[PDB]
Design a protein around this motif. Structure first.
Motif, short mmCIF file in Angstrom:
data_model
loop_
_atom_site.label_atom_id
_atom_site.label_comp_id
_atom_site.label_asym_id
_atom_site.label_seq_id
_atom_site.Cartn_x
_atom_site.Cartn_y
_atom_site.Cartn_z
N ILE A 37 -11.10 1.85 1.57
CA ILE A 37 -10.96 2.96 0.64
C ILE A 37 -9.54 3.09 0.15
O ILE A 37 -9.20 3.21 -1.03
CB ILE A 37 -11.41 4.29 1.26
CG1 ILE A 37 -12.93 4.28 1.49
CG2 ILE A 37 -10.98 5.46 0.40
CD1 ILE A 37 -13.42 5.42 2.36
N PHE A 38 -8.63 2.99 1.15
CA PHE A 38 -7.20 2.96 0.92
C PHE A 38 -6.72 1.81 0.08
O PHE A 38 -5.83 1.99 -0.79
CB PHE A 38 -6.45 2.92 2.26
CG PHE A 38 -6.44 4.23 2.98
CD1 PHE A 38 -5.76 5.32 2.47
CD2 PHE A 38 -7.12 4.38 4.18
CE1 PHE A 38 -5.75 6.53 3.14
CE2 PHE A 38 -7.11 5.59 4.85
CZ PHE A 38 -6.43 6.67 4.33
N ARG A 39 -7.21 0.57 0.28
CA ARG A 39 -6.81 -0.59 -0.51
C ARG A 39 -7.25 -0.55 -1.96
O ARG A 39 -6.40 -0.78 -2.79
CB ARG A 39 -7.35 -1.88 0.12
CG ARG A 39 -6.69 -2.25 1.43
CD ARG A 39 -7.31 -3.51 2.03
NE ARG A 39 -6.67 -3.90 3.28
CZ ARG A 39 -7.10 -4.87 4.07
NH1 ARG A 39 -8.18 -5.57 3.73
NH2 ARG A 39 -6.45 -5.16 5.19
N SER A 40 -8.51 -0.10 -2.25
CA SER A 40 -9.04 0.05 -3.55
C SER A 40 -8.34 1.15 -4.38
O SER A 40 -8.32 0.98 -5.58
CB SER A 40 -10.54 0.35 -3.49
OG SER A 40 -10.78 1.60 -2.88
N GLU A 41 -7.95 2.29 -3.82
CA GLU A 41 -7.17 3.40 -4.33
C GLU A 41 -5.81 2.90 -4.62
O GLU A 41 -5.22 3.37 -5.57
CB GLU A 41 -7.15 4.55 -3.32
CG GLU A 41 -6.39 5.78 -3.80
CD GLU A 41 -7.04 6.45 -4.99
OE1 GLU A 41 -8.24 6.21 -5.22
OE2 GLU A 41 -6.35 7.22 -5.69
N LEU A 42 -5.23 2.00 -3.81
CA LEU A 42 -3.98 1.34 -4.13
C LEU A 42 -3.90 0.37 -5.28
O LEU A 42 -2.97 0.37 -6.08
CB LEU A 42 -3.46 0.57 -2.92
CG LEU A 42 -2.12 -0.15 -3.11
CD1 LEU A 42 -1.02 0.84 -3.47
CD2 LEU A 42 -1.74 -0.92 -1.85
N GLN A 43 -4.95 -0.48 -5.39
CA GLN A 43 -5.13 -1.38 -6.53
C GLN A 43 -5.25 -0.57 -7.80
O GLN A 43 -4.64 -0.97 -8.76
CB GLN A 43 -6.35 -2.27 -6.33
CG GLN A 43 -6.19 -3.32 -5.24
CD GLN A 43 -7.46 -4.10 -4.99
OE1 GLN A 43 -8.57 -3.59 -5.18
NE2 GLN A 43 -7.31 -5.34 -4.55
N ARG A 94 -2.82 1.37 7.80
CA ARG A 94 -1.54 2.21 7.86
C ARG A 94 -0.55 1.72 6.83
O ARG A 94 0.09 2.57 6.22
CB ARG A 94 -0.93 2.15 9.26
CG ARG A 94 -1.72 2.91 10.31
CD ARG A 94 -0.92 3.08 11.60
NE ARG A 94 -0.62 1.79 12.22
CZ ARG A 94 -1.42 1.17 13.08
NH1 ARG A 94 -2.58 1.72 13.43
NH2 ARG A 94 -1.07 0.00 13.60
N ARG A 95 -0.37 0.38 6.64
CA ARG A 95 0.61 -0.10 5.67
C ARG A 95 0.32 0.27 4.25
O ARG A 95 1.24 0.64 3.55
CB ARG A 95 0.74 -1.62 5.75
CG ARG A 95 1.43 -2.12 7.01
CD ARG A 95 1.80 -3.59 6.88
NE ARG A 95 0.62 -4.44 6.75
CZ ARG A 95 -0.06 -4.95 7.77
NH1 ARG A 95 0.32 -4.69 9.01
NH2 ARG A 95 -1.12 -5.71 7.55
N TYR A 96 -0.99 0.15 3.85
CA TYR A 96 -1.50 0.44 2.54
C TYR A 96 -1.32 1.92 2.26
O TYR A 96 -1.02 2.31 1.12
CB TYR A 96 -2.96 0.02 2.43
CG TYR A 96 -3.18 -1.47 2.36
CD1 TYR A 96 -3.18 -2.14 1.14
CD2 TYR A 96 -3.37 -2.22 3.52
CE1 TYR A 96 -3.37 -3.50 1.07
CE2 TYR A 96 -3.56 -3.58 3.46
CZ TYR A 96 -3.57 -4.23 2.25
OH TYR A 96 -3.76 -5.59 2.19
N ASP A 97 -1.48 2.78 3.29
CA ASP A 97 -1.39 4.19 3.23
C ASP A 97 0.01 4.65 2.86
O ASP A 97 0.16 5.57 2.08
CB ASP A 97 -1.81 4.81 4.57
CG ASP A 97 -1.88 6.32 4.51
OD1 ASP A 97 -2.73 6.85 3.77
OD2 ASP A 97 -1.09 6.98 5.22
N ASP A 98 1.09 4.02 3.38
CA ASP A 98 2.48 4.33 3.09
C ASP A 98 2.87 4.00 1.69
O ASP A 98 3.53 4.80 1.02
CB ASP A 98 3.41 3.60 4.06
CG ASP A 98 3.35 4.16 5.47
OD1 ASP A 98 2.81 5.28 5.64
OD2 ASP A 98 3.84 3.49 6.40
N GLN A 99 2.49 2.82 1.19
CA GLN A 99 2.54 2.39 -0.27
C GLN A 99 1.70 3.30 -1.14
O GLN A 99 2.09 3.46 -2.29
CB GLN A 99 2.06 0.95 -0.42
CG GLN A 99 3.01 -0.09 0.14
CD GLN A 99 2.46 -1.49 0.08
OE1 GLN A 99 1.24 -1.69 0.13
NE2 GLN A 99 3.34 -2.48 -0.04
#
Lengths: 281, 61, 361
Positions: free
Chosen positions: A3-9, C2-7
């Motif tokens: 969820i976090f990776r897709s929100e980041l992309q 955790r890493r993706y969360d900080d970015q």
């Protein structure tokens, strides 16, 4: 985790989408930026009301758009106002109207103190008066003495008075501006007073600068009877530089240096340290 | 070439990257940047040259 | 994870910051879609449906009104907002004459205080009582029944102490200093000269107390000497306007006017009558006692050796004014920069004072 990776992309993609939208806005603003467009002078900075008076002799009441700041609205500034919606799109280079109607500019005189000699004792006085304040401003500041912002020279030009002025400017690597006093003297209603306030404003901007005034008896008559009435252009221009000089102190941002062909004028008004402190023969 | 104030009466031709000089009392197009050959030389009222307001059309023809 | 969360947070804030700026820009484009709107001033109400307005584009017009506005908010001398081509009253802004800041040039308070220029004492005491005191109590002057002071005149050479006084007074009262350049009040168009003096006074009464400092009322209220009107009818226009406001029902009493002129030689008997200029303050040269006081203040503010003698200087000096005494303080210091120190000595001062003395009477 996903969820976090897709929100980041998505955040990475999104910056592009937004960057696209502004791109669209900018092309519109740029097409309006380049002249032919009106210049103007702001006079009034509920509503954010600003009044501008555009150079077609018309006043308009507009709102301030976010494409300017209210810290860029002020008189004695060009602002670019639209021809047809009368809204201040952009702010334009400094200083309204004429940027001094005539000044001769010499951006390196080549004069040296090896081009003169035997004026030695007078070289020391001039260097003390204007150069020593510029260079060791913190020393004058800390002492708490006022530092001149005008010097008076009198004597013959071409003996080596004029040469040494030019030489000081060259050495400090100040802007040299030669303003000729008969130029100021307009037959039309105060042009000269106006020229001087612009002369000083540009001087403050250009600092280190030597404002070189050839002749100070040409405006240095002002009469003493009820005859000053006639010759009020010449009294007012001379008074305007002195009021400005005393209206600041303890700074050496602008120097003004004055020259006469033959001294015949001196006044109790010239005196004061922020005014013409130095009297070199 | 003889003048006392500069005129090009609108300038079709061409930060800043285009130059409009018309110095009259009525109609003032004030560029604060000089420096340039840009439109392809003199135009639109031919009196390119020296100002009494410093727009400073430097050196085309 | 955790890493993706900080970015994710770092990007997220950046994206908010960029978005706010663009949306604000899009809104800016939206103001451009709305029309211009021209200024005029109401001359007079012709009717409650029809008005005479003089547009600030020049012409006078008969214009109408809209519903949304009220007619009591169109009662004359109001500045109003006009359509571009429709020419009807779209909104009304507050009344003005379109205010100046470049020829009604404002300096809140002064640059010096009255302890910064002590040793002009007599002149300090007189100015205090004439300008400050009518603001603080009108009440005493009313019970007696005499009018209040309304005018002050300064003459003397300028920036010897004269300019200094004028600023110093403004500071203590909080009064707004309003500087008029005389050659801003002449400009070469129909009715501008009249407007600047009137507007300037008009605003002084609104925002009173305020000082109108008119420098050189010899360019703006002379009385000829050889009876020319070269540009000297413009001189009559400015003087005339000035008299009208005093002589009229425009009320100065809490609004103060100060004129300054080098030598009094071209002021009509009319101004010398009170209720115009009452108080006419001179510049003399300081006492012995005054020299000692002015020296104390000027070498105070300069760094010095612990032992010092003001008195010594004071005897040698005659025919100096405040600007001449300041120069003596600074003259001593130039030789102290020379001597590779921050400290005036009594020894610098003794030289400084005698040199300033030699170069003049």
């Amino acid at each position: 985790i996903r969820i976090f990776r897709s929100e980041l992309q998505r955040l990475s993609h999104e910056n592009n989408v937004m960057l696209e939208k502004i791109k669209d806005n900018k092309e519109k603003i740029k097409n309006n930026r380049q002249l032919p467009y009106l210049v103007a002078n702001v006079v009034e900075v509920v509503g954010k009301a600003a009044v501008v008076k555009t150079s077609s002799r018309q006043t308009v009441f507009l709102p301030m758009v976010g494409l300017v700041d209210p810290d860029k609205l002020k008189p004695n500034d060009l602002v670019g106002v639209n021809k047809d919606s009368y809204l201040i799109l952009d702010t334009l280079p400094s200083e309204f109207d004429s940027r001094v109607k005539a000044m001769e500019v010499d951006e390196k005189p080549t004069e040296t103190y090896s081009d003169v000699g035997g004026l030695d004792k007078q070289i020391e006085e001039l260097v003390e008066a204007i150069v020593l304040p510029m260079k060791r401003a913190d020393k004058f500041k800390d002492m708490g003495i006022r530092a001149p912002k005008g010097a008076l020279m009198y004597g013959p030009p071409g003996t080596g008075k004029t040469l040494l002025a030019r030489a000081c400017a060259a050495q400090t690597n100040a802007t040299f501006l030669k303003l000729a006093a008969p130029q100021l003297v307009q037959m039309y209603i105060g042009e000269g007073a106006k020229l001087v306030r612009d002369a000083f404003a540009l001087a403050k901007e250009k600092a280190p600068t030597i404002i070189f005034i050839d002749e100070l008896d040409a405006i240095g008559t002002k009469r003493f009877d009820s005859e000053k009435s006639g010759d009020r252009e010449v009294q007012r221009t001379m008074l305007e530089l002195l009021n400005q000089l005393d209206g600041f102190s303890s700074d050496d941002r602008v120097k003004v240096l004055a020259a006469t062909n033959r001294v015949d004028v001196l006044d109790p008004a010239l005196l004061r340290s922020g005014r013409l402190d130095r009297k070199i023969e | 070439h003889p003048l006392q104030v500069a005129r090009c009466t609108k300038i079709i031709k061409g930060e800043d990257a285009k130059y409009v000089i018309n110095l009259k009392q009525i109609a003032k197009f004030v560029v604060g940047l000089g420096e340039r050959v840009s439109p392809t030389d003199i135009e639109e009222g031919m009196r390119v040259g020296v100002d009494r307001s410093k727009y400073n059309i430097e050196l085309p023809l | 994870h955790r890493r993706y969360d900080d970015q994710l947070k770092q990007r997220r804030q950046n994206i908010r910051d960029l978005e706010k700026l663009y949306d604000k820009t899009e809104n800016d484009i939206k103001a451009l879609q709305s029309i211009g709107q021209l200024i005029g001033e109401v001359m007079k109400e012709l009717s409650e449906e029809k008005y005479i307005v003089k547009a600030s584009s020049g012409p006078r017009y008969i214009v109408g009104v809209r519903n949304s506005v009220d007619r009591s908010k169109l009662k004359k001398g109001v500045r109003v907002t006009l359509d571009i081509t429709t020419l009807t009253i779209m909104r009304i802004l507050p009344r003005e004459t379109d205010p100046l800041v470049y020829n009604m040039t404002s300096f809140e308070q002064g640059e010096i205080t009255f302890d910064g220029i002590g040793g002009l004492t007599e002149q300090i005491r007189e100015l205090r009582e004439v300008i400050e005191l009518p603001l603080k109590n009108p009440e005493i002057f009313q019970r007696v029944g005499i009018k209040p002071p309304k005018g002050v005149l300064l003459y003397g050479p300028p920036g010897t102490g004269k300019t200094l006084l004028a600023k110093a007074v403004a500071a203590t009262i909080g009064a707004n200093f309003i500087f008029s350049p005389a050659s801003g009040i002449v400009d070469k168009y129909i009715g501008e000269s009249a407007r600047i003096i009137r507007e300037m006074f008009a605003y002084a009464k609104e925002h009173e107390p305020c000082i109108i400092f008119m420098d050189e009322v010899d360019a703006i209220g002379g009385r000829r000497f050889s009876e020319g009107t070269s540009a000297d009818r413009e001189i009559q226009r400015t003087l005339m306007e000035l008299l009208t406001q005093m002589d009229g029902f425009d009320n100065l009493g809490q609004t103060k006017i100060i004129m300054a002129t080098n030598r009094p030689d071209t002021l009509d008997p009319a101004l010398l009558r009170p209720g115009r200029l009452d108080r006419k303050v001179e510049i003399p040269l300081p006492n012995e006692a005054g020299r000692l006081e002015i020296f104390k203040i000027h070498t105070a503010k300069v760094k010095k050796t612990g032992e010092f003698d003001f008195e010594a200087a004071v005897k040698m000096s005659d025919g100096f004014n405040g600007a001449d005494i300041r120069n003596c303080a600074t003259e001593a210091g130039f030789f102290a920069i020379r001597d590779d120190r921050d400290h005036i000595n009594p020894d610098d001062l003794m030289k400084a004072v005698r040199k300033v003395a030699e170069v003049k009477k």
